[PDB]
Design a binder for this molecule. Structure first.
Ligand SMILES: [Mn+2]
Ligand SMILES: [Mn+2]
Ligand SMILES: [Mn+2]
Ligand SMILES: [Mn+2]
Lengths: 418, 402
């Protein structure tokens, strides 16, 4: 294992790259060279649907992303998959998504993107359908949660989403969607989610083929969208950044929920990797705590600039790691229950006023009577009680904050280090 | 107390508040039904597509449906996909809708400046469609179907029309989506239904009511008596009932035509399902109306035959005759098939030759009176005999005693 990860770091450019042969480009009847793309991932529409506090988060936040896209006048929308939480989404979940897509993505706004090529008699690229007035085309790969008929196909068949980066085998051919706006040229690629190991082994077997545009060969901005583990504990259960062909200029990394919207430059492959994160916390994990963002990717020539946008509808999430053997006045190895609880309770209150502060920061507002109050926050304390410390039933502890936290059932987790 | 129903009349309350409209009518497509069936798995998608295809081909103004659009409350992803696909390929386009409305995501679809609706669909929900999101809501939100005639409470129903005009003719379209029959019945008995009629041109309106209810029952509270329906109606589209009675009937006391077009697919091996399926085109021109019946071509034929063994002359009675009844019944199944196949070629308007499409496996059912001395097989054993030849694996035969 330890050395298998080094085999991975050294190996690069796997599989094969081969080559292949205001303005309105939409066909609806009833600057100029900078492609504007809103990037997001993992909305998990439907997630927490049945929860009396959290039930509408997924729908409101998915709607936000499309709202921002329309408010900020972008040319298109690119998503890293996992649109829906459930493989067969509830009627409500499907409805809300379709509602948000219909109200935010259709209108008279000219689509300025010329489809040079995408490489059934349903119109495939939606804004090219003369019967549908598409303002802002949505493109998305499928995630592991979107796994014959996915709900993605349903979004596609209604004409509101462009499901792309289809993967039926595991010989994988990755051909681009070609878009021109002024002199700027976007070559767009996607690999929808494949079992991480099946994908790792396909690269090792050089069974991933990339098709590149022969025309304007060096003029294309190359964007790859993926839905894969970016790290793992097994060395074959994720996708090594170095495997990805270095002709790519930009990589949108879905599947990972943590918001690392700033991007990392891969100095070897010389491309930037953006992991925008989910639009909702799907577990009380450390990775979900980082404030959720979407982005606007502006592409001009083969240069790009990234604007991060703090999501305003996400429930604040604050998680604290506490090692009780690093806290006095907690006298260990004695009946210290009242002392442990007091500390932990004070930490919850602390986290809470942190969450409210974080929320108001996202809104650009202040706690005053004429402004909207923050929603109940998610709060989790992870507590290592090694060294001689008394605990409390976690639900009993959680009930000390009813009406004060969104998760009034598991605010606290007690564990021992291993 | 049935007699009481025939006596009662005009229940609930009425409150006031080219030149021919062409409507394709149908009902109970049950998209999704028999999905998992290796023979019949595609029937419901193919036939539901037929309905819209015809509409498009025959260039109607609109489509009207009487519920049970989907067989399952939560349709499979396949079912919803095919409905949406058919709806989008068949109802969208450059043809203007010449229907002026006189009544955002819950508005009339062809009015939406972002979707070009060539042929608008209107539909109520049936009991197979009925939480508070229905699959009808999904079709509505995509802008592909106009869900109407919603029933928010069963104990106080306000029925309001959609108002449409083409040239000089005015259509008042009413729907009552499915309610448990007993609930609906009572609501009529307590005057808990309220019918809203337009103040202006109150009598220029061709009044059309769409329903999804039992048209007959075994108890007198589990169906919707024709009499209760306000006599200001000129036409009633009768959904829910699967049997094709496309020619309709005239209620002389209420003065309205009832049309029960039937389902577009057979969901039981009931006698009612055997009648050949049609859709229709209602040609409204001012006050009168011309209904054109249209034979469906994608529906699997279904032939049912009733047999009394004691009346079968080639079988000897009160004897070990098992060999002789099977031979007869097997010839009866063979005879039904040939009737099925001819029925299918009639629909296509073709003959059986090698250049032409040949018929699908038909549904075949024999109900067999074996009273007197006669010898049966296990029904299942009998139906296994016809794997290559009939579409139904089960219930090919039913023996009963008089
Ligand atoms: Mn995810
Ligand atoms: Mn995932
Ligand atoms: Mn039905
Ligand atoms: Mn029904």
């Amino acid at each position: 294992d330890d050395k298998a990860f080094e085999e991975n770091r050294r190996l690069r450019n796997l599989g094969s790259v081969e080559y292949i042969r205001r303005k309105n480009f939409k066909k609806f009847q009833k600057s100029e060279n900078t492609i504007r793309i809103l990037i997001s991932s993992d909305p998990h529409v439907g997630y927490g649907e049945k929860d009396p506090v959290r039930g509408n988060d997924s729908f409101v936040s998915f709607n936000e992303i499309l709202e921002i896209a329309r408010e900020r006048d972008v040319d298109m929308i690119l998503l890293g998959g996992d649109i829906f939480h459930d493989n067969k989404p509830s009627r409500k979940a499907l409805y809300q998504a379709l509602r948000s897509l219909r109200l935010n993505c259709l209108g008279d706004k000219p689509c300025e993107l010329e489809l040079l090529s995408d490489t059934t008699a349903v119109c495939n690229i939606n804004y090219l359908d003369p019967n549908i007035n598409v303002a802002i085309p949505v493109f998305s790969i499928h995630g592991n949660h979107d796994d014959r008929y996915s709900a993605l196909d349903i979004l596609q068949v209604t004409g509101l989403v462009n499901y792309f980066g289809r993967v039926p085998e595991n010989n994988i051919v990755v051909s681009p969607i070609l878009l021109q706006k002024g002199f700027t040229k976007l070559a767009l690629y996607g690999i929808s989610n494949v079992r991480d190991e099946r994908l790792y082994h396909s690269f090792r077997e050089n069974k991933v083929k990339f098709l590149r545009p022969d025309l304007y060969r060096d003029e294309w901005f190359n964007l790859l969208t993926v839905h894969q583990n970016h790290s793992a504990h097994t060395p074959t259960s994720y996708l090594p950044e170095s495997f990805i062909q270095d002709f790519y200029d930009f990589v949108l990394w879905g599947h990972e929920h943590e918001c690392l919207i700033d991007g990392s430059y891969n100095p070897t492959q010389k491309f930037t990797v953006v992991q925008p994160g989910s639009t909702i916390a799907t577990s009380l994990s450390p990775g979900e705590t980082a404030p959720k963002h979407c982005g606007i990717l502006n592409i001009t020539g083969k240069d790009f600039h990234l604007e991060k946008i703090r999501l305003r509808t996400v429930r604040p999430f604050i998680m604290k790691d506490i090692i009780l053997s690093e806290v006095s006045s907690i006298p260990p190895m004695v009946e210290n229950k009242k002392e442990v609880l007091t500390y932990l309770i004070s930490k919850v209150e602390e986290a809470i006023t942190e969450a409210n502060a974080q929320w108001y920061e996202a809104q650009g507002t202040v706690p005053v009577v004429e402004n909207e109050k923050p929603p109940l926050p998610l709060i989790r304390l992870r507590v290592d009680y090694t060294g001689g410390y008394q605990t409390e039933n976690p639900q009993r502890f959680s009930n000390r904050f009813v009406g004060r936290v969104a998760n009034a059932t598991d605010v606290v987790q007690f564990y021992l280090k291993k």
